Enzyme design. Structure first.
Site, PDB file in Angstrom:
ATOM      1  N   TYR B 130       0.860  -1.180   0.000  1.00 36.02           N
ATOM      2  CA  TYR B 130       0.000   0.000   0.000  1.00 36.02           C
ATOM      3  C   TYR B 130       0.897   1.231   0.000  1.00 36.02           C
ATOM      4  CZ  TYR B 130      -4.558   2.179   1.138  1.00 36.02           C
ATOM      5  OH  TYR B 130      -5.774   2.865   1.174  1.00 36.02           O
ATOM      6  N   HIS B 178      -4.341  -0.555  -2.031  1.00 36.18           N
ATOM      7  CA  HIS B 178      -5.549   0.296  -1.910  1.00 36.18           C
ATOM      8  C   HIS B 178      -6.788  -0.357  -2.563  1.00 36.18           C
ATOM      9  CE1 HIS B 178      -3.599   1.149  -5.748  1.00 36.18           C
ATOM     10  NE2 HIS B 178      -4.793   1.510  -6.198  1.00 36.18           N
ATOM     11  N   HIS B 182     -13.001  -3.620   2.611  1.00 39.19           N
ATOM     12  CA  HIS B 182     -13.172  -3.779   4.048  1.00 39.19           C
ATOM     13  C   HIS B 182     -14.036  -4.984   4.392  1.00 39.19           C
ATOM     14  CE1 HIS B 182     -14.209  -2.931   8.275  1.00 39.19           C
ATOM     15  NE2 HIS B 182     -15.436  -3.281   7.922  1.00 39.19           N
ATOM     16  N   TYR B 190      -3.425  -5.024   7.697  1.00 40.48           N
ATOM     17  CA  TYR B 190      -2.328  -4.117   7.315  1.00 40.48           C
ATOM     18  C   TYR B 190      -1.173  -4.284   8.294  1.00 40.48           C
ATOM     19  CZ  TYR B 190      -6.053  -1.573   4.769  1.00 40.48           C
ATOM     20  OH  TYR B 190      -7.111  -1.231   3.946  1.00 40.48           O
ATOM     21  N   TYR B 220     -10.789  -1.956   7.997  1.00 39.02           N
ATOM     22  CA  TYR B 220     -10.310  -0.590   7.818  1.00 39.02           C
ATOM     23  C   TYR B 220     -10.012   0.083   9.150  1.00 39.02           C
ATOM     24  CZ  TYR B 220     -11.215  -0.499   2.723  1.00 39.02           C
ATOM     25  OH  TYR B 220     -11.212  -0.697   1.363  1.00 39.02           O
TER      26      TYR B 220
END
Ligand SMILES: Nc1ncnc2c1ncn2[C@@H]1O[C@H](CSCC[C@H](N)C(=O)O)[C@@H](O)[C@H]1O
Lengths: 8, 246
Positions: B130, B178, B182, B190, B220
């Site tokens: 990302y 990206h 979610h 992440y 998220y």
């Protein structure tokens, strides 16, 4: 705070 | 001379004969991705990639990696993003990510595109990077949620963003993190990652085994009690998730 994955 | 390996916490490493001062500087230094097989080999100066050619680590003998260069002329260099430049080569894909994920229509309703696994992998596998431009929490928090669909907190000072029109793969495909949608029941997280081209970023890492062609999802992690500071679709989604919890 308007972003992913923060450490609140 | 022996060889040194220096590992990052994410599992990638720099490897080579160091110089008089213990620095990763020379013409035969490599960055080796977390698969311990895909590598970028060539000229580095104090650990920064000047010219890395795509290679495969074929074996290690007495600790020394033996590589074979891939055909083609895939070369990479350290190219950290700024506030306004996402990449010097927005259409040059990452060769490790390219073997692990692809973008397609999401399976989540009305969610646009999603990120999918090309192959079956185990837990704890880095799948995608990302990368994005680097802007401040002030700018991002002070602006409307419609501009903040791709913002990822990196640390207490930096947010990574993939702003229009770089959110379309025909314009930007150097990294694809990206593109992961979610889920409150995600199969990935992440995680911090130090990338030889992008610098310090985050990656998508599996938290369990994943099958070929499975959609990759992450939580998220918006603040639920600052109601929730989050976009509408997520708040609506959070209700439902909470519903299933009893
Ligand atoms: N669980 C979910 N439900 C609905 N929309 C989602 C979602 N997760 C992500 N999205 C969408 O994806 C955006 C974040 S970027 C994720 C990739 C995006 N789907 C794309 O096609 O480029 C959000 O603004 C939202 O529109």
């Amino acid at each position: 705070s308007k972003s992913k994955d923060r450490k609140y | 001379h022996g060889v040194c390996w220096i590992y990052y916490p994410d599992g990638g490493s720099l490897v080579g004969e160091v110089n008089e001062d213990g620095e990763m500087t020379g013409e035969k230094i490599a960055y080796v991705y977390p698969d311990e097989r895909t590598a970028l080999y060539g000229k580095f100066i104090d650990g920064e990639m000047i010219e890395g050619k795509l290679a495969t680590l074929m074996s290690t003998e007495e600790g020394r990696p033996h590589f074979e260069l891939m055909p083609g002329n895939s070369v990479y260099h350290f190219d950290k993003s700024t506030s306004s430049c996402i990449s010097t080569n927005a259409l040059l894909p990452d060769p490790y990510e390219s073997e692990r994920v692809y973008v397609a229509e999401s399976l989540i309703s009305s969610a646009g595109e999603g990120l999918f696994s090309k192959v079956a992998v185990g837990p704890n596998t880095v799948m995608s990077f990302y990368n994005g431009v680097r802007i401040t929490h002030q700018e991002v928090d002070s602006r409307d949620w419609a501009l903040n669909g791709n913002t990822l907190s990196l640390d207490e000072e930096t947010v990574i963003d993939v702003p229009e029109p770089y959110n379309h793969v025909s314009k930007y495909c150097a990294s694809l993190g990206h593109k992961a949608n979610h889920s409150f029941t995600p199969n990935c997280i992440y995680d911090m990652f130090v990338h030889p081209r992008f610098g310090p970023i985050k990656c998508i890492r599996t938290l369990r085994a994943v099958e070929a062609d499975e959609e990759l999802t992450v939580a998220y992690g918006y603040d639920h009690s600052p109601g929730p500071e989050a976009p509408e679709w997520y708040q609506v989604e959070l209700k439902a998730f909470q519903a299933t919890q009893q």
